[PDB]
Amino acid sequence: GNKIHPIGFRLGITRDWESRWYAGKKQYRHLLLEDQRIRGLLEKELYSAGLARVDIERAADNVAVTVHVAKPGVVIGRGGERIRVLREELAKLTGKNVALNVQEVQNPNLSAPLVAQRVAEQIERRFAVRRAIKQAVQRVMESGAKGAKVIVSGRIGGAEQARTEWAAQGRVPLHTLRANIDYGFALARTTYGVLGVKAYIFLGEV
């Protein structure tokens, strides 16, 4: 049980925060619990949209929130009717009065969280783990990326003995503090139990 989170490790560089807003002492804890409330619903809802990140900027009673998706449609809605439901369901949580932008993911095949969830799902549907994994690494590796790697937890195939599956291609330097490796974790509830899924994608460097 070693190695740090590849993101948290690089936060100073090659990776910005998910919530970039000043605050302090009396507020910070309140102004943060909120962010979690926010993210809470978005992930509980926008699942089929393909969640990947939830930036949350601030300045004062005019929050940001910039959900990133693979299928920006599913988010918005018909003509923009859903972005009405949510955007409203939002203030029924934070009187704060906040926006709700939506950026599209340029190739969900380079989004560790996505590749992860991608695999997490297949596994839930009962696909061959090792296959799903190799495939995933291929997709990711086959559409850009200077390196990728996926890891599935254990009880592969519902086996009584928890195992751990691999798969990796090209440089994926977890040690190099400047790599720019996207990390993504996906759960996977199952008849037999939870099985975590980890996706690592390497892009450029400097």
Partner 1 sequence: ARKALIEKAKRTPKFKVRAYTRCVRCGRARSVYRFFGLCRICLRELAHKGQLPGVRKASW
Partner 2 sequence: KIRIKLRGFDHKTLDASAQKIVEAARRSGAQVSGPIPLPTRVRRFTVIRGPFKHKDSREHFELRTHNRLVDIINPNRKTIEQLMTLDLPTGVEIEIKT
Q: Which residues bind partner 1 (CB under 8 A)?
A: 4-5, 7-9, 11-12, 15-23, 25, 28-29, 32-33, 35-36, 39
Q: Which of 141, 179, 199, 201: binder of RNA (CB under 7 A)?
A: 179
Interaction pattern, residues 62-101, with partner 2; x per rule: CB under 8 A: --x-------------------------------------
Distance, CA of 51 to CA of 166 (rounded, Å): 24
CB of 175 to partner 2, least distance (A): 16
- 7 contacts which partner out of RNA, partner 2, partner 1, none, CB within 5 to 8 A by kind? partner 1
Distance, CA of 68 to CA of 42 (rounded, Å): 11
3 state SS of 165: strand
Element (H, E) at 174: none
Q: Which of 24, 36, 44, 95: binder of partner 2 (CB under 8 A)?
A: 24
> Pairing relation of β-strands 197-202 and 181-186?
antiparallel
Looking up tokens 């990728």 gives: 148
Distance, CA of 137 to CA of 201 (rounded, Å): 9
CB of 129 to RNA, least distance (A): 12
Distance, CA of 145 to CA of 168 (rounded, Å): 12
**Count of residues engaged in binding partner 2, rule: CB under 8 A:** 12
Q: Which of 58, 68, 155, 198: binder of partner 2 (CB under 8 A)?
A: 58
3 state SS of 122: helix
Token pair for 102: 């939506």
CB of 173 to RNA, least distance (A): 4
> Pairing relation of β-strands 181-186 and 147-152?
unpaired
CB of 1 to RNA, least distance (A): 2
The residues binding partner 2 (CB under 8 A) are 1, 4, 20-24, 57-60, 64
